[PDB]
Amino acid sequence: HTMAAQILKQAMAMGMMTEYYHFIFTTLDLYALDLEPYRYSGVNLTGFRI
Amino acid sequence: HTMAAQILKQAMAMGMMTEYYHFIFTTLDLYALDLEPYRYSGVNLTGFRI
């Protein structure tokens, strides 16, 4: 999740947040993070919880 | 210039910081606050100097 946040930082930094994208992740502490400005990008994304 | 900074904050915020866009800016002194996170997305733009 730490390195997930790192990926999200880098993919903003490369600008790889496009509405084309829909992506696949593993660890499930995903909701808890500092997350807010990302959802304003048109990208499709989905998570998992139990 | 301040409104330019607001513009680019909004444009990265929507994800209109795309490599597809090739743009033109009238003023000159945009460099004071950083453009380096805005640099490495692959975008296209130009300005002027005198």
Side-chain angles (χ1 to χ4, degrees), chain A residues 12-15 17 20 37 40-42, chain B residues 13-15 17 20 37 40-42:
Chain A
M12 300 274 253
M14 199 46 237
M17 313 313 208
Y20 299 98
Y40 309 99
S41 317
Chain B
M14 188 58 249
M17 200 66 53
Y20 285 122
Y40 283 113
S41 158

Side-chain angles (χ1 to χ4, degrees), chain A residues 12-16, chain B residues 17-19 36-43:
Chain A
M12 300 274 253
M14 199 46 237
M16 303 329 284
Chain B
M17 200 66 53
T18 73
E19 93 296 336
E36 215 160 21
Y38 293 85
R39 178 198 280 183
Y40 283 113
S41 158
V43 307

